[PDB]
Write a protein that binds this ligand. Sequence first.
Ligand SMILES: [Cl-]
Ligand SMILES: [Cl-]
Ligand SMILES: [Cl-]
Lengths: 421, 421, 421, 170, 170, 170
Amino acid sequence: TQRVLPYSNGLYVINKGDGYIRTNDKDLIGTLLIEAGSSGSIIQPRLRNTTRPLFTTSNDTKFSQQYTEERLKDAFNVQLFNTSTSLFKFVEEAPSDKNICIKAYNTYEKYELIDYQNGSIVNKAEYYLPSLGYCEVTNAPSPESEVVKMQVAEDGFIQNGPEEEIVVGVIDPSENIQEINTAISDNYTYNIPGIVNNNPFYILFTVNTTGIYKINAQNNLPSLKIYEAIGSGNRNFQSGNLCDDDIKAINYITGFDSPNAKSYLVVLLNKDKNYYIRVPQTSSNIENQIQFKREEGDLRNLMNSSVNIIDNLNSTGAHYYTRQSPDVHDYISYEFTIPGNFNNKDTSNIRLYTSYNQGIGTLFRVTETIDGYNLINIQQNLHLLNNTNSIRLLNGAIYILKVEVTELNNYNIRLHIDITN
Amino acid sequence: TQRVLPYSNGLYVINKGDGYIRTNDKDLIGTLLIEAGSSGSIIQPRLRNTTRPLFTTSNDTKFSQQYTEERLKDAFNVQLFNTSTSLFKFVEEAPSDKNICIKAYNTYEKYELIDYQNGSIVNKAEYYLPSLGYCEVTNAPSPESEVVKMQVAEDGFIQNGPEEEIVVGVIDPSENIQEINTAISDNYTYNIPGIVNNNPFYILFTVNTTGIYKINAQNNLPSLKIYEAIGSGNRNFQSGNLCDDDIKAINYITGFDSPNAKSYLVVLLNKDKNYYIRVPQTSSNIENQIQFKREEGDLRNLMNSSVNIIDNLNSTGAHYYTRQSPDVHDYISYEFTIPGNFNNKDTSNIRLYTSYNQGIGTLFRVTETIDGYNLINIQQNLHLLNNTNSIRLLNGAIYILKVEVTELNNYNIRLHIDITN
Amino acid sequence: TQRVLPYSNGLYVINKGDGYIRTNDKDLIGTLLIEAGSSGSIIQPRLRNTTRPLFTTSNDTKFSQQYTEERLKDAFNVQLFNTSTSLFKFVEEAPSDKNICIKAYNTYEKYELIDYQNGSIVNKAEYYLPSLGYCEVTNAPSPESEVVKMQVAEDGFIQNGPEEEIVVGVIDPSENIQEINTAISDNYTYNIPGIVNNNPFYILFTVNTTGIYKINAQNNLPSLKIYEAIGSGNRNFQSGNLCDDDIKAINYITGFDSPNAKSYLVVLLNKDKNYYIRVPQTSSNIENQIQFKREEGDLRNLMNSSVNIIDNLNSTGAHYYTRQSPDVHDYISYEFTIPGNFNNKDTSNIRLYTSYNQGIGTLFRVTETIDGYNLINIQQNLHLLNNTNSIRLLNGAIYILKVEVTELNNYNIRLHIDITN
Amino acid sequence: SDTIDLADGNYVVRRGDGWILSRQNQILGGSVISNGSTGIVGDLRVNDNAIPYYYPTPSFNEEYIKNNIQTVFTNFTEANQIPIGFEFSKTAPSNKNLYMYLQYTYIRYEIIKVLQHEIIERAVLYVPSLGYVKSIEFNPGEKINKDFYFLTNDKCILNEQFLYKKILET
Amino acid sequence: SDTIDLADGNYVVRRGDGWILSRQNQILGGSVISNGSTGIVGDLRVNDNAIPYYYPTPSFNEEYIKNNIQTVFTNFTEANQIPIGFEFSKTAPSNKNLYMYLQYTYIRYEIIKVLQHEIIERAVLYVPSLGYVKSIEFNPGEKINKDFYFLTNDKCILNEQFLYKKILET
Amino acid sequence: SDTIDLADGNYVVRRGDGWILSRQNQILGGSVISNGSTGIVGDLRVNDNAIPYYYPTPSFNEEYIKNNIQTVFTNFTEANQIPIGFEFSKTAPSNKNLYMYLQYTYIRYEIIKVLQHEIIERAVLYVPSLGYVKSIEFNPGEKINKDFYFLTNDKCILNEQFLYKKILET
Ligand SMILES: [Cl-]
Ligand SMILES: [Cl-]
Ligand SMILES: [Cl-]
């Protein structure tokens, strides 16, 4: 009954909430018995600034305490781990009727750092950052009830703060960040530099005018991924240039981890924002370029998604294509050519379906003119999961299927293209 | 019109209450004139920890300041004399009608240390421990009344806190504390060790089972005293053993200071408590033993008291016996033999009375069987003070008179045993 | 439309009020947005004692910062300029209805130091002493109105505290203070010592009995001025002696700055007060004495004023005499002799008037007896401003005109004495 | 008695917060407030008022007590280096006098040895926690109960607890 | 857009107090209070929480930003050496739980270059000011809006301002 | 006058708490609070604001004054080494402005010489005590009485006292 985590490969820092305390009163500050009419206070006055974070990791040699702290700083800008100047204090006035007890606890805000790779967690660490306390008030204990003995709880934490799950991607620090210093207009070609050979790397860029862009490597290999720098563009600014604010907190937009899959990105980019492209490890010594192109015509209909180029569709029968599934409400697209000679008459029956995830598809006929690519919407509201409906398409013609995921049942999405005639 | 202090010889620390201030504004912190509607506060924030105790003594060379402090620590566990981390602060909101004044004073908690010996104080010291203040509020002074001149008061103190007299006996530190490491069951014989020759010393012991015990030295000489260690047995514990918590605060139970008086102790001892026997200075070089015996029979009726053995009753006429009087509701007992041959017929008229203190007596006939001592109650509710009633008792027979003091008019109690025939 | 400042030549420190802040938020501490029901506080806890006074001067080489500070200490006893142990804190509880903002500012108390000489300011400095803050509360800002751009204000201050102008004269520190150590009774002659030759200097003295005194130099030259030491005589005291408390804060009473004008002072002096006479720079090497005389007769009618001796009135026609004008409700007097031989019959018409200031005059006939000077009131309620009324007075006779200023229109007062016959 | 439904062996036991100690009750002093005023007393737990009270036994010495308590329950050596404050406020009613006094509270821990459903040995540790004020309105010359001022035996002002973990051998 | 009715040249601009920064909102921690109690959180602006955030440009480096801001507006280098405190109080209603968390606020300053009624370059300085608390009452298991916890873009919790002075050449 | 029904000789006299000194009234500064807010000002008596003001005479020099005052009355040299705080709170009414200012108060002591029912010599000592705030609600441009701001002669804000002890010869 595990949630499918449709996260792109990478590092994530997750704020799992505030108000955590350990079991068996390890974080109890103490209890005040306050008599009726009176008041009492428990105070953390920071006469000393020292705090005590707690840390556990699955991998001391990558996710050390230092590294994790650097990640929490990348994600949320946390800078004080060992210290605090933030005071907290709890005050309780007992009612006129009855006596009152207040128990105060130290608390932690829990951060989880994960390395997520191909559908599972491969490195994990938990950093509990000292927080600003928990105060429970209760009626005065009566005599004596009686004392009933109790075994200690297992070691662990109990959350007393509100539910919270804030997921923030972070730049992998082992990878270089290259910059495109000029803001991108209608067209740009980025040559891949030998200073970052073979290793995956990031490209930081920004755009002159808000618009939809197509982005790809030569011959659409390798596949690329694109992220937005969270909170970028709110600050310094220079017309037609990139302003780098060293933001390492990233929101995944679209793109595949499998580098041998041909694809291109179609994405809406804001001029008041910075973006990172990640180019993966390529096992080839040939020169490559990243191409950027502003789209003014029908290709805009494909935002935001990666478009997989399907190449091996040259016989009749069954064909399937497996990719990481987008999350709910996100898109994946497929561009394919119906086998056979294009003679504008010869036709084939085509069945399009998924195996496990539900998705809404729209099918486009593609024709390239001298004015660019044209997309004719020929089929709307296709429900893909175990679809039995079929449609006759032209031999040798080119189609794009755009899929919106609506039910995420499997980490992968498997598109079937079954062709008969 | 002096109170009789029926204290056993020894040292006592007395808490005489809190809220003491010196005369002539020596401890005035200051006054705030607070206008109507407004509030004011006077604060002792312990930015410095220094405090100023006051001390006077009758005897610098025994009751020095150091010694007295050691006594206050023995009695009440006071450990900070020169310093304090305890904050105090007074707040006053003036009513909407009128202006208001608050005057704040430093205060002291007054401790008296006494050495009490044979019915009077022979050494005395007063230790005034810095306390947590006194705040008086008054209406605003009017113009101008007029100023009337006043001579200064004599030097001294005024108490502004509530009435208090808590008396706590303390172990004399010039005397050795020997220990009986095994808990006492039905019988035990403690040999008096040469490491503590001639000097008075204490014996710390505890008991296995709650019960009434008879305790005495060889031939009931010397007389002994017994104390309870206040708050003992609440903590560490080992089955069948003594656990010494170094408690020097002692509650006198019973026993005489006059060491040439033959006596034995009959006392209820709790298993969850520690006790101290004091054996006095003995002017004899002979070996002695303290004997402990659990009482299961009639001797239990004598708890808690010392039983004086009366030896010199061998003629008719008047006889008197002077001892320190127990306090109100406490007991003293006397075991005596009617002069003459026991022939079970020859009898004598006996008059029993006290001179100054009122006491209720009960008279027991004593017979020793092979099953122990038997006590037959032959006379109840004897009112001893100037008693004129007389009773016929058997010549040569043995009797125990148990006396409960009900009116304490004299430091001593004088029992008369007048015998005619 | 300038106020006439009728100040005597000298130095003055003026407290111009509290609650000053600079323009353009230079002294903004910050703003708290407090949600409804909740409270917020801004606190200056003096964890560091440092403060930042602001200072401007017209003359760095006389009115340096050090000198000015010494003056503020002379005037108001300010002693801490760079530091403060005085805490301030602002608290606001937002109502149940709406959110609330509090803005807190640092403030200054503004002091102006002036050197005032012959009717204008010749040196000026402004010392802004760090104060205890300003807190404005406002309703929560709504979205978004809209932001309207604004140019910055000129540099300067805005006062947020209440109106205040407290003017305090101070002793000029470049001048010696000589003392008359014996308290003055009916008569005293002070010889002017060579240790203070030629330079102006002060004489500090006090009086045995409250009374009206005439004070003058030999032949009424030079003219003198007298001041009261503010707050003198409230403290230490020795019968018949001066007690000097080093008070440099002075209240001008009367006397002229023009040293070649013949005059004498008639002044009410209190025995519980100290006074300073200033004797000016004299350009003569001859020996001089200050004379003090208790007045018991009619000369008392001239308090408090300087009496100008008019000497050059020996022909008929127009005559005028210019002096610094007293302030409103203060007095100036003139003693003059009608030209001609006194033969008790020959008479002259006399017109007395001022040019610009309104004043009420009373005219006295003066006769010297062997019992002293006698003053006969011969004219009351003279309105001097452009007076056209005239009176016949005796040739060779002596008169004193006492003038109370009631309308101050000019820094100078010009008395005209027009004589016809 | 000292009978307990547990197997044989040694145990750490947390007996709860809120314990106050005999004899010690007034040694910090108290305040007298009058006629509508408010008195506030507090303290600051650091260093040399946070030193704990050990009561060891032949089986259970001090280090054994410290190490077993700090493993299972709160590490008081680390915690008590960091100052924590606490305060109490009392308000005197009009035309009356109020006396209020302060004492420390402690967590009580125990190491017990159990043999045949019986506690045959017990070591105790008191770790300073926070504090507790008692107050009384009084008249001049009014006699006050000794019990208000002076505690004969340790007690818990809250409900006692018995939270246990069995200790396993080296 | 970035269009402004000003002449050509460079300007210092004070954009007002009350700015909070993206991502950073919960890094100081928060308090949970319950059932009638009052929670108070605060901080102390000195030294190393008063270090400002610079965002320079090719024309406007850090020293240019500091020197022009401190001339016209508040000298934050002098001011922030002297500790200033601030606190907020929240009271939990009966039988409810309240979570409150703290973040710093900043004055936002800008140096802008204007050419032909257009801002073509902008440098930014955030100077720490005071702080700001947000609170919410919550039930066990209740889902909370992400927005309550996490800020995507810098914003002003007060009204924004635009107070400008033209900078004149060396 | 200076007439007193006492025998001949020298006397220490305590003249009471609550004295304020001329000219000095506003030198600590004041606060302006507005529209429902509360202003709190205070100070801390230690070291160099607790240095007393001596006014000796030919008979009674400073050491004579100090030694006779400290013998009979409070030893201010010992007392004033230990910091004592005091605070005052004022609340501004709605839509009004309030100004509040602080000054120190002093105990006034005197050494007097009496001859034939007459004080012929008097030395004075002012020892810093606590403080005192005055407040006023004001409108913009409203003229304020000079007396509110500035004190011409020392006075006592409480009732004056005259508590005396005769000094006996060395
Ligand atoms: Cl699927
Ligand atoms: Cl008797
Ligand atoms: Cl005129």
